[PDB]
């Protein structure tokens, strides 16, 4: 624990500073240290954790896609052999990405999920588990690509089951979970019809519950509903 000597509260404070400075690797390391203090995370702290690692892995995924595209081109017919360098460097980025994903999955398994009893925390963490297995799936090609995909699906499914039982259809965590599970179906599991069906049902059931919300909750819910609609427009 490189952050083991820093107070939990100081780690959270510095995570917020790192965010303002757009230093997301630092933000992630501060939040990792905060999780490893062993106390449950508040709602704000959970979102600091997810924002930090989302930004880190998001940059890695963007770089991996650039490099994978170059690699695919250099492997086409008529291409000039430039040697092992493109593959080596894509592999380097891929390994770093897998390391970040394993770290996040490690925090969820030790011991954020098992200590999360409320729907709002348990669904949030299981959505994260699905998301980070999804990112591992995006780069997987070995004897365990199918097992990685099923690990993502399993986590997403447990989160959906809880969210449908315990949260209203407009809950932003429920909505965001369905958004991402829908993308999982479309992009990972090769189930575009399930992806479209999930996004549409999620949108329609949220629409019918908007009348119950305050202006501030309405804004939060309609924001994610628009992302569901955006994806449906991309897919139909």
């Amino acid at each position: 624990g490189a952050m083991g000597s820093m107070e939990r509260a100081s780690l959270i404070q510095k995570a917020k500073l790192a965010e303002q400075a757009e230093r997301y690797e630092d933000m992630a390391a501060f939040m990792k240290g905060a999780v490893e203090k062993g106390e449950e995370l508040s709602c704000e702290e959970r979102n600091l954790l997810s924002v930090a690692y989302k930004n880190v892995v998001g940059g890695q995924r963007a770089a991996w896609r650039v490099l994978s595209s170059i690699e695919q081109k250099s492997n086409e017919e008529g291409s000039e052999e430039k040697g092992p360098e493109v593959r080596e460097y894509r592999e380097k980025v891929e390994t770093e990405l897998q390391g970040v994903c394993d770290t996040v999955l490690g925090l969820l398994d030790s011991h954020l999920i098992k200590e999360a009893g409320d729907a709002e925390s348990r669904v949030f963490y299981l959505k994260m588990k699905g998301d980070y297995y999804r990112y591992l799936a995006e780069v997987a090609t070995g004897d365990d690509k199918k097992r990685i995909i099923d690990s993502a699906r399993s986590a997403y499914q447990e989160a959906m089951d809880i969210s449908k039982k315990e949260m209203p259809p407009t809950n932003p965590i429920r909505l965001g979970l369905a958004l991402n599970f829908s993308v999982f179906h479309y992009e990972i599991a090769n189930s575009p019809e399930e992806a479209i069906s999930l996004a549409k049902t999620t949108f329609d059931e949220a629409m019918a519950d908007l009348h119950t919300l305050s202006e501030d909750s309405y804004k939060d819910s309609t924001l994610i509903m628009q992302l569901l609609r955006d994806n449906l427009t991309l897919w139909t």
Partner: peptide, 5 residues
């Protein structure tokens, strides 16, 4: 790419 949060 499609939107995720």
């Amino acid at each position: 790419f499609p939107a995720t949060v």
